[PDB]
Write a protein that binds this ligand. Structure first.
Ligand SMILES: *[C@@H]1O[C@H](CO)[C@@H](O[C@@H]2O[C@H](CO)[C@@H](O)[C@H](O)[C@H]2NC(C)=O)[C@H](O)[C@H]1NC(C)=O
Ligand SMILES: [Zn+2]
Length: 361
C-alpha cells in the first residue's frame, strides 16, 4: 500500500509524485506545450483514410514529424496498416485484444485476465504488425475503465511504460502532470477502482478533462455533451482552441485530443476545425504534437523549450511489412470466423485471448 510522497525519495527519472507543479522546477513560459492526439480502437481500410489525410506530412516547428498515439484493439485490425502508421512515426499502443463488453468486466478483471488481454497483446502486436516490441509502451483500458492495481501490475511485468486511462476533473488548472505509482496518488477517481498500491515502474499519464460549453468536464472530444452543432466549423474551432488555451496559457500540462475516428469523418466541419487547430500548433515554436511516450520521456528529463528544440527528432527504426492475407480463421472461444491482413506468416487459428498468436488448438 502506497504512502504519501517522500519528495526526497521520489526523484527523476525513475520516480515522480502526483502533482500539478511543472517537472524540473521550470517556469510555464519555459515549458514546452505538448499535444497528444490519439485515436482509439481498430485500424482498418476505412479509418486509415482519415489518418492519411489529416496526419501525414505534418511536422512540428522544429521540423520533426508530428506525432499521434493509436490505442489499437485487436479485433478487425489490419496489421499492415498498423505497420504503415508505425513507419510514419506514429505510436502504436495497446487497447486490448477483445475490447469485450460489458464495462464492468474491466473494473474487476483478474491479474490473469489482464495478462491475457493486455500483457499478451504486446507480443501479439509486435508479431503481426512486424514492429519492434520496444516501441509498444502505452495502455488505454477499454471504456476508460480502471482496474485498480491490476492493470499497473501487468504493465510492470511486461515493460509497458505508461497508462492513459485515468481522467482528472479536479486537477485541470493548474493541470496534473504525469507521475509514477511508487507513492500515493492525489488524483480523483471518476471511474473507480483506481490503484492505491505501491507499484513501481509504470507511469500515469492523466487525461486532463476538457470543459464543454456549459463547463461540464469531458475526457474525450466525442464525449463532450454541450457542444457546438456538428455543422458549425467555426464554433468547433473556437471550442478546441479554448480548451487548448487553458493549458497553453496555464501551467502547460499535456493537452489531449482523445477521439474516435468515426467522430472526425462523420462530421466534416469538425474535421476542418480539427485540421485548422493542427495547422496552428504546427506553426507554434513552443508547442509540439508528439507521441504519448515522448511526453513521459520529457517528464523524466525535463529541459526548457530552447534545449528541447535542439534535441534530435524521434528515431523511427524502419520495419518492412511482408504482407499476408489469411483466412478463414476460427478460434476455440470465438464462434466467429475471420480474415486477417498481417505482416507475418498466417497463423493456424484466429489470434485471441489465451492464444494471442493464433498458434494453438
Ligand atoms: C490495491 O492494492 C492496495 C494495497 O494492497 C489494496 O489496499 C487494501 O485496501 C483495503 C480497502 O479497500 C484495505 O482494507 C486493505 O487493508 C488494504 N491492504 C493493505 C495491504 O493495505 C487494495 O484493496 C487493492 N485493490 C484495489 C481494487 O485497489
Ligand atoms: Zn475503445
Amino acid at each position: 500500500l502506497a504512502t504519501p510522497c517522500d519528495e526526497e525519495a521520489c526523484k527523476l527519472p525513475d520516480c515522480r509524485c502526483s502533482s500539478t507543479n511543472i517537472p524540473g522546477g521550470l517556469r510555464a513560459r519555459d515549458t514546452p506545450q505538448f499535444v497528444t492526439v490519439t485515436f482509439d480502437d481498430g485500424i482498418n481500410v476505412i479509418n486509415i483514410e482519415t489518418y492519411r489525410e489529416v496526419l501525414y506530412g505534418r511536422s512540428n516547428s522544429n521540423r520533426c514529424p508530428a506525432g499521434a498515439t493509436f490505442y489499437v484493439s485487436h479485433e478487425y485490425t489490419n496489421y499492415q496498416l498498423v505497420n504503415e502508421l508505425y513507419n510514419r512515426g506514429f505510436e502504436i499502443a495497446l487497447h486490448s485484444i477483445s475490447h469485450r463488453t460489458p464495462q464492468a468486466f474491466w473494473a474487476d478483471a483478474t491479474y490473469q485476465n489482464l495478462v491475457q488481454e493486455i500483457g499478451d497483446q504486446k507480443r501479439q502486436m509486435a508479431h503481426f504488425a512486424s514492429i519492434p516490441a520496444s516501441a509498444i509502451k502505452g495502455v488505454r483500458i477499454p471504456f476508460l475503465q480502471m482496474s485498480g492495481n491490476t492493470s499497473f501490475q501487468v504493465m510492470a511485468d511486461f515493460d509497458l511504460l505508461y497508462d492513459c486511462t485515468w481522467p482528472t476533473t479536479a486537477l485541470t488548472n493548474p493541470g496534473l502532470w504525469p507521475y509514477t505509482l511508487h507513492h500515493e496518488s492525489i488524483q480523483d477517481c471518476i471511474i473507480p477502482p483506481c490503484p492505491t498500491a505501491s507499484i513501481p515502474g509504470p507511469w500515469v499519464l492523466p487525461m486532463i478533462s476538457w470543459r464543454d460549453l456549459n463547463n461540464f468536464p469531458c475526457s474525450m472530444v466525442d464525449g463532450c455533451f454541450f457542444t457546438p452543432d456538428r455543422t458549425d466549423e467555426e464554433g468547433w474551432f473556437k471550442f478546441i482552441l479554448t480548451n487548448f488555451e487553458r493549458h497553453y496559457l496555464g501551467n502547460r500540462a499535456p493537452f489531449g485530443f482523445f477521439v474516435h475516428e468515426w467522430f472526425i469523418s462523420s462530421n466534416p466541419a469538425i474535421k476542418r476545425a480539427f485540421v485548422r487547430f493542427m495547422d496552428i500548433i504546427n506553426n507554434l515554436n513552443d508547442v509540439f504534437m508528439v507521441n504519448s511516450a515522448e511526453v513521459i520521456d520529457w517528464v523524466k528529463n525535463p529541459v526548457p523549450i530552447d534545449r528541447y528544440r535542439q534535441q534530435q527528432c524521434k528515431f523511427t527504426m524502419p520495419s518492412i511489412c511482408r504482407p499476408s492475407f489469411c483466412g478463414p480463421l476460427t478460434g476455440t472461444h470465438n464462434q466467429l470466423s475471420y480474415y486477417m491482413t498481417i505482416c507475418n506468416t498466417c497463423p493456424r487459428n484466429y489470434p485471441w485471448v489465451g492464444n494471442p498468436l493464433g498458434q494453438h488448438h
